[PDB]
A paper describes a structure:
Aldehyde-alcohol dehydrogenase (AdhE) is a bifunctional aldehyde-alcohol dehydrogenase highly conserved in bacteria as well as fungus, algae, and protozoan parasites. Structurally, AdhE is interesting as this 96 kDa protein oligomerises to form long filaments which can be visualised by electron microscopy. Here, we present an atomic resolution cryo-EM structure of AdhE forming a spirosome and show that this spirosome formation is critical for AdhE activity.
These molecules are stacked upon each other to form a right-handed helix with a 70 Å helical pitch and 150 Å diameter. The cryo-EM structure of AdhE shows that the ALDH and ADH domains in the AdhE monomer are separated by a linker (residues 441–448). Together with a β-hairpin protruding from the ALDH domain, the linker makes a three-stranded β-sheet stabilizing connections between the two catalytic domains. Two AdhE monomers form a dimer in a head-to-head arm-crossing fashion. F670 in the ADH domain is inserted into a hydrophobic pocket formed by F462, I460, and I712 of the other ADH domain and holds the ADH-ADH domains together. This practice reveals that ALDH active sites are located towards the outer surface of the helical structure while ADH active sites reside towards the inner surface.
Residue numbers in the entry:
A (entry chain B): 1 to 445
B (entry chain C): 396 to 869
C (entry chain D): 446 to 495
D (entry chain D): 644 to 693
Write the structure that this text describes.
């Protein structure tokens, strides 16, 4: 049954309301079977969803989508297997008090273009763990993949004891149906993710809202670091799925005394510097209405090189520009969602720390930041860098991505998503989203 | 319940475990919004740091390995002397139709222990045989499980031993938690409480009695599931050579080439420590003399056969600590789909993979190139001049060429066809199913320790050039 | 009669090795499951900080 | 030094002997040769500096 107009929108909202009110009376031992069946059947269909997403969206690499889809399923399953979310949580039997838990209701969900198929599994699983319901609002470019993913999870959950539906989605989205659904009366929480355009729209709506965003993440390289492994790590993490992962590297601040050598270390490998006229030919293409040209997202390096208007070797990886001004008017300081990068020059250590703070103050949400140095000889610089920076994750000698060798790089880390904030303005650190954000607890006496 | 909503009565407080009526605040206005109490955790943002930590390596094996010609009945005397009373035997029905499983039961019934045989194992484990076997096991309640055979009975026994010990743990969380090693997060339930496992091998050329691996195929969807962690290795392995004197050619040639590939790969992988290079080289040393002599005659030469048997389990020791590579996965899928026996699948594939990995330095999908790995060229050269196939003054590429010229002459007199087409594979269903097998052999743990990180368009190149009988070259 | 002999290959069950692997090795004795311990050493190693 | 030199020569003799004894099977020749291989490069370098 398709959805195009406001009337059938109200019809399926009433249907999923009736179904969610049906579902919020199950016991603990029969929610877990649904959760295992959904997680397993979501983890089986790794390959077809990646093939559909690359065929429909027109950008991206297949293998990276396969591995990040697998990781995003298994982490959510293994993290919350046996957690009390239904019925009685705790008690004090010799004084009468009992703490019980109760759900929220119906959640709206907004899905971007860049990670179209991985967030649907995450939001679907943590919704039906805690006895709720969910309505998805996809993007017009890649929409069949998200509906297919939600459909696989849904009919996986149906043949285990679930009601006749719990998950809904919109066919043929537009700019008015999303605003119709965000201001519908009986929904209770919205989950928005993506760029800075719609998270401010989600904030200013008078409803509870958390936003999963990303900031420009800087990397500081001082003079007492290894040089080869740093460049290898940056080039390895940045080219992963053409750099559409949430909060990858965006800027490299290099201290002066080891500056120029690092230049040729990018030159004798996949990077390509640019220092002449071509900067203008690439500064005119990333930012056309002040609002991030959507023609260079997810594309390889040579295609945006030729769309800029010049030629380049075929096997190149990264376009390196170098600017001196740090302000909002400069086009490279924005987040870019493309295999490009900008680098800066600093005098000494504290100047680099100050300039990195000035970079991270522009994104609005503190997510990560990186430092490359010796860690067995300068603990004071480590403590100073951890003291001055204001982000959620602070990484020392580690890429801001996933998939190396060994267990995992790093193995005690969540995915780059699942970390959301609740504001936009200033000095706002994000935090990881789980089932405790979706449950209201009550007490008797 | 039966309490005023205020403060100040008599006794301690009404009520004494309650906050004031203030300090409880909300964050919205609209609907069904419950308030909550305000404290210092609403006024503090917490941050985390993370340094780069190094890793550790290991060397793990079964506790005791007994080996040589005529050592089966003197090995299982010590299970009689201490202290077991009930037993269970897992095998294939072909071994039960011939007189092989009676060599255990006739000895065990002399002292007197309850024995029975589960002879229902197909060439692949099918996830429903193991449930009937586990039902038999916890109906009988043994405390020694003896696996006999090669390949399928061993890992069938491993899986039906892991659910005899824990009958409540369901299979799906085993398939989700434990899929690879290199990851110690978090832990496996404690086994070895009420049973223990003995492994007896029959065929010469698989090393699955010292490895913690199992692969189970599902009936309904046809989905494979690997399981892998070091709590599935047996407690005792028995390597006898009277059990293998009568197997025909070319069943011996398949196991020989299987052990060749298992030793050839596990020396060059990126997890190769220094505890396991020596035994990989020892396994490669012991085959090039004693394999053709065991192929042409036998059992008229009862010396080469037992040494090939022992060198097969040496390579099994080798690859259980540094893992396999790409031709392993491609061989599994090419064998499982077309019903080729496993063992000549990677006999056809190894030369193209050696030509694949031996590229000078294309820095397009490399990782930490200046950190631990020397090169994949140099270790192939080290194999070549350890094995004694070099002029005293040479360069690298000549040594590599002399290396892969050798095993083609080996494949000549062991008598195996030259491409997949001569094995009896039509062109129609192969060109139909090449893109099925192309990316399906990408995710199947390769990852893996291949020195060169692959991609999907480069694997169908190999799968085409092996079917036409060409060589991968650029 | 004249009977033949057998040979063996016996080792400890698990060997952990490399640079900086002492505290991450004895974490698994914490996670399972022991509660009491005893250390045997020489007094020179006890006089220094080992 | 020369507490390291004593242990080095001790391991030299332990590997030199256990290859030629009359109980040497084929599971333990390879690691005796690997132990003899790893000392002749890395022992004097560890003796002079360290």
């Amino acid at each position: 049954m398709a959805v195009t107009n406001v009337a059938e929108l109200n019809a399926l909202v009433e249907r999923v309301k009736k179904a969610q009110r049906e579902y919020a009376s199950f016991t603990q031992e029969q929610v877990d079977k649904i959760f295992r069946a959904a997680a397993l059947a979501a983890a089986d269909a790794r390959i077809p969803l990646a093939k559909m997403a690359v065929a429909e969206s027109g950008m991206g690499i297949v293998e990276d989508k396969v591995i990040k889809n697998h990781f995003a399923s298994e982490y959510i399953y293994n993290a919350y297997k046996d957690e009390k979310t239904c019925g009685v949580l705790s008690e004090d039997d010799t004084f009468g008090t009992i703490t019980i838990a109760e759900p929220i209701g119906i959640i709206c969900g907004i899905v971007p273009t860049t990670n179209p198929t991985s967030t649907a599994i995450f939001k679907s699983l943590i919704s039906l763990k805690t006895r709720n319901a969910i309505i998805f609002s996809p993007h017009p470019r890649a929409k069949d993949a998200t509906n297919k993913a939600a459909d696989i999870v849904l009919q996986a959950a149906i043949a285990a004891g679930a009601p006749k539906d719990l998950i809904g989605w919109i066919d043929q989205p537009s700019v008015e149906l999303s605003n119709a659904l965000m201001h519908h009366p009986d929904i209770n929480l919205i989950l928005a993710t993506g760029g800075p355009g719609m998270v401010k729209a989600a904030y200013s709506s008078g409803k509870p809202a958390i936003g999963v965003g990303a900031g420009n993440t800087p990397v500081v390289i001082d003079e007492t670091a290894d040089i080869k492994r740093a460049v290898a790590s940056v080039l390895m993490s940045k080219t992963f799925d053409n750099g559409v992962i949430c909060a990858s590297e965006q800027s490299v601040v290099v201290v002066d005394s080891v500056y120029d050598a690092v230049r040729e270390r990018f030159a004798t490998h996949g990077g390509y510097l640019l220092q002449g006229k071509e900067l203008k030919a690439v500064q005119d293409v990333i930012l056309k209405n002040g609002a991030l040209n959507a023609a260079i997202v997810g594309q390889p390096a040579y295609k945006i090189a030729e769309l800029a208007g010049f030629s380049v070797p075929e096997n190149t990886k990264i376009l390196i520009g170098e600017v001196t001004v740090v302000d909002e008017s400069e086009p490279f300081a924005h987040e870019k969602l493309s295999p490009t990068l900008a680098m800066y020059r600093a005098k000494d250590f504290e100047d680099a720390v100050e300039k990195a703070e000035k970079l991270v103050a522009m994104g609005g949400i503190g997510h990560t930041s990186c430092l490359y140095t010796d860690q067995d000889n300068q603990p004071a610089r480590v403590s100073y860098f951890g003291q001055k920076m204001k982000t959620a994750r602070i990484l020392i000698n580690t890429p801001a991505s996933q998939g190396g060798i060994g267990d995992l790089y790093n193995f005690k880390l969540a995915p780059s998503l699942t970390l959301g904030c609740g504001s936009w303005g200033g000095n706002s650190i994000s935090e990881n989203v789980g089932p405790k954000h979706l449950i209201n607890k009550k007490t008797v006496a | 319940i039966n309490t005023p909503a205020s403060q100040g009565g008599i006794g301690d407080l009404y009520n004494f475990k309650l906050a004031p009526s203030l300090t409880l605040g909300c964050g919205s206005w609209g609907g069904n919004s419950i308030s909550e109490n305000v404290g210092p955790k609403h006024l503090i943002n917490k941050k985390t740091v993370a340094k780069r930590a190094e890793n550790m390596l290991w060397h793990k094996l079964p506790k005791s390995i007994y080996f040589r010609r005529g050592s089966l009945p003197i090995a299982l005397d010590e299970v009689i002397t201490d202290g077991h009373k009930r037993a269970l035997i897992v095998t294939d029905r072909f071994l039960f139709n011939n007189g092989y499983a009676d060599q255990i039961t006739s000895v065990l019934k002399a002292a007197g222990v309850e024995t029975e045989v589960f002879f229902e194992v197909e060439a692949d484990p099918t996830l429903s045989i193991v449930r009937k076997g586990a039902e038999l096991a916890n109906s009988f309640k043994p405390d020694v499980i003896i696996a006999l055979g090669g390949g399928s009975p061993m890992d069938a026994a491993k899986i039906m031993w892991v659910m005899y010990e824990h009958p409540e743990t369901h299979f799906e969380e085993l398939a989700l938690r434990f899929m690879d090693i290199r990851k110690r997060i978090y832990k496996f339930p404690k086994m070895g409480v009420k049973a223990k496992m003995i492994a007896v091998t029959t065929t010469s050329g698989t090393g699955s009695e010292v490895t913690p691996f199992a692969v189970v195929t599902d009936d309904a969807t046809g989905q494979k599931y690997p399981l892998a962690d070091y709590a599935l290795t047996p407690d005792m392995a028995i390597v006898d050579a009277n059990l293998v004197m009568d197997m025909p050619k070319s069943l011996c040639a398949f196991g020989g080439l299987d052990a060749v590939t298992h030793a050839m790969e596990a020396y060059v992988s990126v997890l190769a420590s220094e505890f396991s290079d020596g035994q990989a080289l020892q396994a490669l040393k012991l085959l090039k003399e004693y394999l053709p002599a065991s192929y042409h005659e036998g059992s008229k030469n009862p010396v080469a056969r037992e040494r090939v048997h022992s060198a097969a389990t040496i390579a099994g020791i080798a690859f259980a600590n540094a893992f396999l590579g790409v031709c392993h996965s491609m061989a599994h899928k090419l064998g499982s789909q077309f019903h080729i026996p496993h063992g000549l699948a990677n006999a056809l594939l190894i030369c193209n993979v050696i030509r694949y990995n031996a590229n000078d330095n294309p820095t397009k999908q490399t990782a930490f190139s200046q950190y631990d790995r020397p090169q994949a060229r140099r270790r192939y050269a080290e194999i070549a001049d350890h094995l004694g196939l070099s002029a005293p003054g040479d360069r690298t590429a000549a040594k590599i060429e002399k290396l892969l010229a050798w095993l083609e002459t080996l494949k000549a007199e062991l008598g195996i066809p030259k491409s997949i087409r001569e094995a009896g594979v039509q062109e129609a269903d192969f060109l139909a199913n090449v893109d099925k097998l192309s990316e399906d052999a990408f995710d199947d743990q390769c990852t893996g320790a291949n020195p060169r990180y692959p991609l999907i368009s480069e694997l169908k190149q190999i799968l085409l050039d092996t079917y036409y009988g060409r060589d991968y070259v650029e």
